């Protein structure tokens, strides 16, 4: 005979095994499954401090930049990018980068819509305050694989050939 | 040891739907039982 407590796991008298198999847990079974039901109710996101900061800063961005150009963000060594930023310092021209996520839906509201196809790729926003186009193009002429897709100048959407014209 | 056990009273307090389920009349309890023996008295304690 085996003691009340043992380590070999202790085979149960058959009537008790039946007793066990009868009392097992049976989980609640749905009529229709939840995921195959229609979409869940709406969990709407709300503006953080960062979202308000970006909406306000990007709102100011179209105010201060007289020439807003869209230059495709391209991978250069820290050397090339810093030298680039220093030359842009030398003509006083500015460069700024934004998240696509918060930059996209702002321009999908009213004014600047025509920029939407240019922002699906990797973008870099060239900020030009009291600019001359010849000088902005001066640098993009030096490095060939750093293309300029243009964009907004004084509320008008303009492209590469247009900038070739405004420079001359 | 093995014993004569006990049944606690809660067992014998019927819910409202047990009347509807076994078709007993909630107002008046019934007079006589018809009791049939289904199972054996072997393998069971002497009492």
């Amino acid at each position: 005979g085996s003691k009340a407590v043992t380590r070999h796991r202790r085979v149960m008298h058959f009537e008790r095994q039946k007793l066990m198999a009868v009392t097992e847990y049976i989980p609640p079974k749905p009529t229709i499954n939840p995921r195959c039901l229609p979409p869940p109710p709406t969990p709407p996101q709300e503006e953080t401090g960062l979202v308000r900061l970006l909406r306000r800063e990007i709102a100011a961005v179209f105010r201060d930049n007289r020439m807003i150009a869209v230059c495709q963000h391209v991978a250069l060594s820290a050397e090339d990018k810093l030298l680039l930023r220093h030359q842009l310092r030398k003509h006083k021209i500015l460069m700024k980068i934004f998240p696509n996520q918060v930059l996209k839906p702002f321009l999908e509201e009213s004014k600047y819509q025509n920029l939407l196809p240019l922002f699906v790729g990797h973008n870099l926003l060239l900020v030009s305050e009291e600019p001359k186009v010849k000088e902005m193009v001066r640098i993009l002429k030096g490095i060939p694989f750093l293309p300029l897709l243009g964009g907004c100048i004084d509320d008008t959407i303009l492209s590469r050939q247009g900038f070739i014209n405004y420079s001359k | 040891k093995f014993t004569r056990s006990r049944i606690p009273d809660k067992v014998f307090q019927p819910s409202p739907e047990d009347h509807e389920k076994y078709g007993g009349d909630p107002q008046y309890p019934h007079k006589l039982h018809i009791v049939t023996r289904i199972k054996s008295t072997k393998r069971r304690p002497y009492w």
């Binding site: 149960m12 008298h13 097992e24 847990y25 | 093995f2 069971r44």
Partner: protein
């Protein structure tokens, strides 16, 4: 992308003697008189040491079992060397071993008397916390190295915190109110149906068939 506020600890105080103390192989007042071995003290649910005190984390015992010295050694060295003494501290939720265990030599015929004292052990019931770890760490660290010591104990054991514990308990009663089949072990064992009480033990009414011998089954409703 998106930032979320990081959980901070301003109220967490690191006490002195942050490491685990050394437990003594033999009690200071050694028991002179060999005692009967109660299996009953390993058996079924636990009463003492069920709730947290100071710490956020613990190692929970999912079976009953006997903790002897070699185990304490393991939990101690391991948990001491694994933790950052600045941000973390530990505590024993289990006494140093008080129960004498007896052997007879090899080649002994049955009888002649009880044997002599080889051992000392602490009984541990399923549902008790062995070690309590407080600190300013997240549960991920402790869970990382606690799972080792848990894995190495005699009984099956888990690494838990307050949130985890309460979650699994609320689920544990949710199952019992969600249970779709009319027949639970409580109802039958208490109503002595089918004379089932002849196969069951007297302790079976209390355990409600969730504990069986030394083992514990969490899925049993």
């Amino acid at each position: 992308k998106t930032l979320l506020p990081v959980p901070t600890f301003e109220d967490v105080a690191i006490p002195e003697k942050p490491k685990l103390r050394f437990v003594e192989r033999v009690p200071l007042v050694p028991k002179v008189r060999r005692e009967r071995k109660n299996l009953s003290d390993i058996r079924g649910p636990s009463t003492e040491a069920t709730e947290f005190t100071e710490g956020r984390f613990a190692i929970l015992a999912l079976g009953g079992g006997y903790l002897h010295w070699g185990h304490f050694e393991m939990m101690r060295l391991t948990i001491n060397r694994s933790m950052d003494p600045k941000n973390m501290f530990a505590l024993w939720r289990v006494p140093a071993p008080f129960k004498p265990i007896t052997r007879k030599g090899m080649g002994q015929r049955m009888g002649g008397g009880k044997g002599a004292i080889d051992h000392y052990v602490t009984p541990v019931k399923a549902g008790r916390l062995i070690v309590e770890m407080g600190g300013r760490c997240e549960f991920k660290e402790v869970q990382g190295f606690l799972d080792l010591v848990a894995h190495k104990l005699p009984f099956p054991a888990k690494a838990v915190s307050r949130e985890t514990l309460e979650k699994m308990r609320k689920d544990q009663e949710e199952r019992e109110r969600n249970n779709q089949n009319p027949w639970t072990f409580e109802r039958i064992a208490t109503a002595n149906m089918l004379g089932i009480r002849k196969v069951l033990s007297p302790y079976d009414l209390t355990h409600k068939g969730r504990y069986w011998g030394k083992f514990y089954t969490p899925e049993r409703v």
